[PDB]
Amino acid sequence: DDPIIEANGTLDELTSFIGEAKHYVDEEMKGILEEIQNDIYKIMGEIGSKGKIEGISEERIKWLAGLIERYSEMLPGGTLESAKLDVCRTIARRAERKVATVLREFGIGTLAAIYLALLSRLLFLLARVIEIEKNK
Amino acid sequence: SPVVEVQGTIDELNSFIGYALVLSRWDDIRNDLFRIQNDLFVLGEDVSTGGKGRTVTMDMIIYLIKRSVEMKAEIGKIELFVVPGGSVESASLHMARAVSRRLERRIKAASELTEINANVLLYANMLSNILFMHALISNKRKEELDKKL
């Protein structure tokens, strides 16, 4: 129960920080972050229910992979928005660690762990893309 | 050693996947199975060496996930409590999936005694899922061919 509580709390922190950071990005990245928040809500629903409630699907992971591929062609906190995204990335890494702990303890959350790894990669890429576009 | 048991189960799963590939009649399924055999070599190297050598990358997991998404789109709604069998291709794929589940159990047992990268277990889970999808695709295509006549 303790790993479940810690993972859900870390995911709540991650989605709160993403909700804070989405007000500094453009409309496209704001919509991407809102979809990410919805996916985090699904992951929290699955983890808090110990897998009884269905969580995210592989389609969301494919969506994250497509975003990573699209943005991969293009000190933390080069800009303020980049700093917000870097903070979100660190919290996403911590949430990934917590979900990995949950998966070992209960066997639920493989797709969630994959999604969180891809999410940390995407947050890093989005911060770098914001820095590049603002510099350009 | 638990790693020895994991490696033996990997070899058995590789044999079963090779048999299913021989029985398979579709290019995409056979390409997936051959890539899975190569990734099983990679995963065995990752487990045996503890990560010093080649390791299971996120790219392989993402490839499995993309193939699973495409096959889910092709299949449509999936019914619960599927009886394994139907055709020799689907039966071999179900046997390979059962061996893959056994490999997942062996990896979970071994991780409690030694350090194993999480990507290994993630890939094993995705491999079981993709083998289930392969079996469903084989059954669906066989049924379509039978309905053609």
Author numbering:
A (entry chain A): 24 to 97, 104 to 165
B (entry chain B): 23 to 171
The authors write:
A potential workaround to the size limitation in cryo-EM is to bind a small protein of interest (the “cargo”) to a much larger carrier (the “scaffold”) in order to make it large enough to visualize readily. The rigidified scaffold described here provides a number of advantageous properties for cryo-EM structure determination—size, symmetry, and modular binding—making it suitable for future applications to many important systems.
In the earlier design, the individual DARPin arms—12 in total emanating from the tetrahedrally symmetric cage—protruded separately from each other, thus suffering from residual flexibility. To make further stabilizing contacts possible, we investigated alternative design choices for a scaffold. All three KRAS variants were found to bind with good occupancy to our cryo-EM scaffold (presenting the KRAS-specific DARPin).
